Design a protein around this nucleic acid. Sequence first.
RNA 1: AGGAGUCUGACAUGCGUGCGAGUCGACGGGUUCUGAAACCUGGGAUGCGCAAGGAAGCUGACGAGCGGGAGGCCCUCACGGGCCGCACCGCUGGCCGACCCUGAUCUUCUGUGAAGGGUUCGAGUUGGAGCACGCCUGUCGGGACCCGAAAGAUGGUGAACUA
RNA 2: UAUAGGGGCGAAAGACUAAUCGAACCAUCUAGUAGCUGGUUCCCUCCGAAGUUUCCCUCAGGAUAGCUGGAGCCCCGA
RNA 3: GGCGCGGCUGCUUCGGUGAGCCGUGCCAUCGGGUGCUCCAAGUGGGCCAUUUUUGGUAAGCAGAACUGGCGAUGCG
RNA 4: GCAGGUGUCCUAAGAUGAGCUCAACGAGAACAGAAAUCUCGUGUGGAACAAAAGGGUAAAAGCUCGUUUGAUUCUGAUUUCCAGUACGAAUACGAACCGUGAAAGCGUGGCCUAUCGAUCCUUUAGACUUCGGAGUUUGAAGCUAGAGGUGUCAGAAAAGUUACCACAGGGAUUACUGGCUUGUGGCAGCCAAGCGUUCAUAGCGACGUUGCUUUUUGAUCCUUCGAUGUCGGCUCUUCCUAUCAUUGCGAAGCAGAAUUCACCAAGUGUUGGAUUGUUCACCCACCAAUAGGGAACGUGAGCUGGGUUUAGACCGUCGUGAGACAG
RNA 5: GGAUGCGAUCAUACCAGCACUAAGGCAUCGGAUCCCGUCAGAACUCCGAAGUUAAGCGUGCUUGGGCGAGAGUAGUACAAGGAUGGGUGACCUCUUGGGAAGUCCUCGUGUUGCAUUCCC
Lengths: 164, 105, 163, 146, 144
Amino acid sequence: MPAGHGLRSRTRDLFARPFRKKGYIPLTTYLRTYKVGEHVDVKVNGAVHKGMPHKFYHGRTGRVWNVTKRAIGVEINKQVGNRIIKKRIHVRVEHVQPSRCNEEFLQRKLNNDKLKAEAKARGEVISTKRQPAGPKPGFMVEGTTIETVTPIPYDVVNDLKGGY
Amino acid sequence: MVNVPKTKKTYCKNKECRKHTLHKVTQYKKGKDSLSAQGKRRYDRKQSGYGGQTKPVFHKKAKTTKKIVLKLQCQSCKHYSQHPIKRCKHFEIGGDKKGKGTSLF
Amino acid sequence: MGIDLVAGGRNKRTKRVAPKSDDVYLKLLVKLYRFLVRRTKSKFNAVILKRLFMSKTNRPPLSMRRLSNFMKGKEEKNIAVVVGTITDDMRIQEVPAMKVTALRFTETARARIINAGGECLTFDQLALRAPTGENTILLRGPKNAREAVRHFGKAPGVPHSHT
Amino acid sequence: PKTKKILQLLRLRQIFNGVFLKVNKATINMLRRVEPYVTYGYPNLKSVRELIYKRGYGKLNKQRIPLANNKVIEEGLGKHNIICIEDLVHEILTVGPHFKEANNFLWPFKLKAPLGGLKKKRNHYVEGGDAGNRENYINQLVRRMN
Amino acid sequence: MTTRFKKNRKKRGHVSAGHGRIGKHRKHPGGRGNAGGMHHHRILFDKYHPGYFGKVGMRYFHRLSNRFHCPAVNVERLWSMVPAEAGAGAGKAPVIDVTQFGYTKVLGKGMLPPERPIVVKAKLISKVAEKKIKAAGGAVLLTA
RNA sequence: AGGAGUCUGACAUGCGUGCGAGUCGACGGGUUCUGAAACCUGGGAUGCGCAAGGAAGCUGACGAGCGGGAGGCCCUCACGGGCCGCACCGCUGGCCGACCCUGAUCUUCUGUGAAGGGUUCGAGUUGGAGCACGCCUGUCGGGACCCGAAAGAUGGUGAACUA
RNA sequence: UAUAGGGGCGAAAGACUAAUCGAACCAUCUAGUAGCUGGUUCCCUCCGAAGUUUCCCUCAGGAUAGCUGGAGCCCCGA
RNA sequence: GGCGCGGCUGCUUCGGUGAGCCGUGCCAUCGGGUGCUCCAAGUGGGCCAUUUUUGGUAAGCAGAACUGGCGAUGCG
RNA sequence: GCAGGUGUCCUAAGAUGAGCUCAACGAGAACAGAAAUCUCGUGUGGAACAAAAGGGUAAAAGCUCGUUUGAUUCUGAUUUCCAGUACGAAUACGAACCGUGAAAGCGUGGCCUAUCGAUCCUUUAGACUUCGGAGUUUGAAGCUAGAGGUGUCAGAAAAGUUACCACAGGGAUUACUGGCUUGUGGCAGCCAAGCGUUCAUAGCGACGUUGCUUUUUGAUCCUUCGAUGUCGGCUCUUCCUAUCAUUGCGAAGCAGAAUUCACCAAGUGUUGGAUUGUUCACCCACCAAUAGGGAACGUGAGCUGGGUUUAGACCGUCGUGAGACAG
RNA sequence: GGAUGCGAUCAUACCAGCACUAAGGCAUCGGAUCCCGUCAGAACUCCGAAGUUAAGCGUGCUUGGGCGAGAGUAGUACAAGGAUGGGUGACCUCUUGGGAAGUCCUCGUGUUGCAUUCCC
C-alpha cells in the first residue's frame, strides 16, 4: 500500500470533545470576528461539523491574514520534512480561539512602556537598551515575512530526517 | 433509478436571456457521419488491411458507471444547457411520474 | 574536532580573479583595486573590482535612458559608475550633463553623452581624478532584470504556479 | 543530535573545550540535557586566574593572538569596562554591570587533557566519577587541565 | 551504472510526456491550419524607432513641420518590407516629434500617441479596397 | 606492445571578448602566396531580437511608490540626525490584447471609439537586449564510452555427408 | 542421377540435408538491439553522498523531489 | 511597535461604525549557526546497534518508528 | 498487519421557515399473541442522521407541516490531492439568478468527518471565428463547456505450452548442502493426580511445568547459480553416549530361576538372509546381544548406478489443443 | 438588596426536598365572537383581568447521592536522559529531571454581562 494522508484518519481528540465540552457550543464563538494580525489557535470544536480545516492543522497558532465571508483566512506554516512553505487556512470562527497569551503580552508591553516614559524623564536603569530603539527606521513587514518563511524551510533537520 | 422530470425550470448559459426559464430533459447519442475525422484516417490508413488503432473498440470491457447524461432544451427560447458531474449509472426516464408521496394507498 | 568548524571550512571562497581576462587592459585594471582599496576611502572601486572579476551574469549594459531618469538632478549630476558598459538605447536628447565612468561604452553612446555634456570617462581616468570615489552613484546592473532569471529551457517559465 | 546542538549553543565544539556560564536554575535545566557529557561547577577566583592566564586567546578584528602579557593590558577591545586580566576576573565572578556579556570570552578555552586522569568518565559525581555539578572538584580538574 | 542505455537515461526523449513527466510543451492538438500557402507576412515596427532615426534619418526629407520633424514613408524605412504583404506601424513608447508617417496599416493607438501634430498617411494598399481597376498606378517596392 | 567520453548537430547553459534597438555574412569578382588560405566589397541568408495576443478578425500604454537596505549632502562634528536617492528583493495597484459587461461623442454604407470595471492568461515600468565566436557543461540524436546473445530479414552456396 | 531451406526427405525419432538442424551454410543488412554482466588508462585541493517520497507495463529501470556539490550575488540566525 | 493630524474608502435604515489604505510629523544563554540564482552527481536495492514497537515459537526473521554509526572512518 | 467499508441508492433520502422532541421503561386500556393504537409519568443524546467506522448534534443537524427548486450558469482565493505533480474532491466567493423565509439569513448536492476517469473521436450547447479571383449554397476546420471506454482506476487494442530448447543475468530469488531457529522431532528433570489386592515413587504414571540435543520436519533467506555432482548402497578411517550385550553395581511386586527398572561405564562386539532402488520398515533363523547418534544425510579427482532427474514411448487422469500431473 | 427580557462560563449551573417576583413594579387565570389553530382552545392564538400564590418563571434553605476545586492520606504506577550497575534469562537497578492514583476532610444544591426597573 502507498502512504497518503487520509484526511479524516486517526481522529480522536481532533473530533471528540471532553464530557465537560459536549453538546452544542454557545453561538458566541460563531459570532466572534477578528481583526487582521490577531493570533488565534486553530483547534476544532467537534460538535460543529462545518467550516473545519483538514484535522492535521489542529493546535497550531496562526495570524489572521484576511477574511472572506463567514470563514477567515489565517496564515500558518507546515512543519517537518524538507523545504516547507507558508500556507493559508480557511476556517470559521467556531474552531478558532483567541490567544490569551497574546493579550497578556500586549498588556505586558504597555506596562513596560509606561515605565520607559517615566524612567526617561526622571529615572535610570539600563543605559544600552536606550541606544538601539531611538535610532531605528521601521516598519511593516513583508520583506521580513519572506525572511521568516525561508529558514523554517529548515536545513539540518531535513537531511537528518531525510534518510531515517 | 432516478425520477428526473422531463419538464424542469432552470437558468440559461446562453447570452439572449441570461436569466431563468422552463427546460426539457433528454438522453443523447447520434455519432457522425459523412467521414472527415478519424474515419478518414482509417479509410486511407488501412494500408495492408490494417484497422490497427481503429480498435480501441475492445478490451472485452466491462465496468458500468456514469454521470448525469442530459440536455435540457428550452420550451420558450431555444438556447438551453447540458449539466456538470455527479455520479449515476443507468438512469430512468419516461415522462417521469413520480416516486409519489404519500400513500394511504 | 567539532563538526561546526568543518562546516566553517565549507563557507565560501568567493575570491576569484576570473578565468582569463584576455584583455590585458582590463586584466591590469582588476588588480589595481586591491592596492588602491585598502589604501584609500573608496568602497565603490572595491565593489566594481568584484563585479569586473567574476561573471557575465554580472557585467552590465546601462542605457542612456537608464542613466537618464535615474540620475535626475537631485543628486546633482555626480559621477555615474557603470561597471560594464554603456549601451546606446535612448533618444530624449538624453542626459542633463554628465560625467559617466565605465569600462566600455559604445561609440554612439560615447558620441551622444559628450555632446550632451561632461565626458564619457574611462575607469582608470576615474581612479586618477576621483581616487576617494565619493559623490558617485553605482548605477547599476543588470543581468538581474526581466529577461532571464530562471526563465530558461524552452518556452518559459512563468508566474508560477507550476513551470 | 539535540544535545550536540546544545553543546554548540554553549559553544563547545571539541572535547576539552570550556566555556563559563552564569547563575540560574534555568541555565541548569538547559545544562541537564547536557549533564552526562559534561562536568561543571564553580572554579575559584585563583583557578579562573590560573586558567585565564593559561588558556585565554584573542578576539575578532584579528585572529587569535592571546591573553598573554601585553595583549590583555593594551589589547583586547572592551567597551563595557576595563578589559584587562585581573580586573576582568573580579568583574566576571562579581557578576555586575555588563559582565554576563564580558563572557563573551574569546571564545573557547582550549584545555589540556587532565594530568593523572579522571576517575572514570561513564559516572557522575555521586559515584566518585567526573560528570555533573561539583564546585570543589572542578577547580581540581582545571588545575590538572593546564 | 551505465551502457549508456541503462543509467543514461533511456534512449530518445520518451517516457517523458506520457507516463513520466516534465518538459517539452507536451500533448498537442490544438489548433493547426492555413497551410504553407496563404500565410505570412505582415512587417511591423513601433513608432519609437523612427523617432530614434529621425535626426540621423537624413535621407528622409523634412517639410512643413520644422527640420527634425519629417515626413517619412515607413515602407521605405522597414528592413524586409519587400517580401512582406504589408507594412504596419505599431504604437509603443513615445513620439516627441511632429512627423508625417506613411504606412500600409497603422494602429488606432498607433496614430494617437503621435497625434502630436502629425499627418498619418495611408498608402493606397492600406485600404486595400482601392481601385486596381485594370488601369495604372500605385505599386509596391522591390529590393533584396 | 595494443586496448574505451569519439565526431558534429540541435536545444539549454557556464566562462570570456568585439560591436551593441540590429547584429550577421555565403557567392561572385577583384588580388598574393598557396591545390591551401587571405583581404575589399556587393552583401546573399532574413535568425534571434526590436513587444505582445490568439481559432480566426484584428488590436497594441508606460506614470507611481512602500519597506529594508548601497551613498552623497546638509550640517553639525565626541555622538548624531534630517533629505534625496537608486541598486536589488519582497509588496501594491492601474494599462495592452484575449473573454465578459456598461459605452458617450457620435459617424448615420456601417462602425469606430473617450470614460470605467471584473476576470484569468500572456505582455509592458524600478523585472530594458543582444548578436558573434571561442572555450564548457549537459541532453537527445546519429554505432554515441568500449566490449559483450540467442536473433530476425535478403540474396546466394551446398544431396562428394545423409534421407 | 531427382527433390534445396518453414523448403526438401522421413516405415514420422523433430530423424536427416558435408563434424553445423524445433529450421543448413555463406555473405550481407551490421558497428542489431541488452531496464542485464564485465571493463573504462595522470597528480593534487575544497566540500562530501544517497540506499528515501509521488508517478510510471511499476518494483535489476525511468521519472520528480528529496541528499550533495560547484559558480555568481546580497547584506539574519538559536 | 505605538500615537496624533488630514484625505480617501467599506459594510451593514438617507443608518451606525470600525477597520483598511495613503500622505505627514512625533516617540520607542547564544553569535555566520545565514538568503537568492544557474548547472551537475550517485541514486531513484542498504545494514546494524540503542530506545519505542507490530507480526512471527523463534531466527544472523520480516516489517515500521527515533536516533547514532558502518557503508564512505583511520588510530587505541 | 487487525477490524470493516465504497464503486450504489436518492427531485426528495435537497432548501428553508413555523411549529415538536426521543429511544425507551413503568403504570392504564374486554379482545392480542407481533399488536401496533390510544394515554399518562419518567426520560438528556442510550434515539434519530439511507449506507463502514468513527464522531457529532435535542425548539436541532433530529421531528412535524407547507411551500419550493440553488442537484441553476459562469468565476474561483485556497486546502486536500502532494510540503512543489494532474483529474478528482473540499472549504469560501464574487458576478448573474431565484426560492423559502418575517427576514436577517440560508442554500457553492446527500449529519459530518467527503463518495472516482485524462487523451483522440464522437456528442451536443451557445455565440462567434475560419476553409487562398469575386460571388453564392453545402459540409468541413475551430473556441468555450458537458456527456459517451479506460476498476492494468496519474489512462496498451491482446491467450497458452515447451520435458526439443536457447540467451543475458541473479545466490538481488527457489530445489539443494551449509548456517540461524527449534514450533515439529528425540531425550531429560521437576511436581505427582492416579494404578499397582493394601501400598504415589518394585513397576506403571496423566495434567501441568522447566529444559537439553541439533540426528526428523517446519521456518528464514545469511552462503554458492563465471557450477556446492543426487538418493540408496558399498568399502574404508575416526568419533559420541541418551549403553543393546559384555564388566562392576543398586532395587524389586529379587525363594531359585527366567527376569523387570535403574547406576558406573565407550575397551571390544553389535551378525547372516527373504520382499523392496529404497532410507525406513516387515519377515526368518541365528546371537551373548544382534543399540542408537555425528564426521558437508562421512565416503562418485573410489566404486556402483537400481530410484530421483533430460531428450523416445505407453496407460490413467486433465485439457478444445500444444501439452500437463508429489500419477 | 433583588423577581421580569436577551445572553456568557457551557458537569462549581443536578436528582430530590422545605420558606418567598405578588392591594394597584408575574405566571396560574377568564372570553374564545375572533386573527390563529386543532381531531378536540388542550396546545396554538386575538381578547382580556373576577380569582391564586397553590405553582412555573424565580427568590431563603437541605449536600443527601452526583461532581469541580482543593486539604491530608497511596510516592505508587508510568515514563525522558545516562550507567564495564546487577541478573542464566524474561528482568531489575542507581543517577538526572518529573510524578496520576483511592480514602477522608472541605468548599459548592451557581457565576457572569446587558436590560424593565422595583417594595423598603
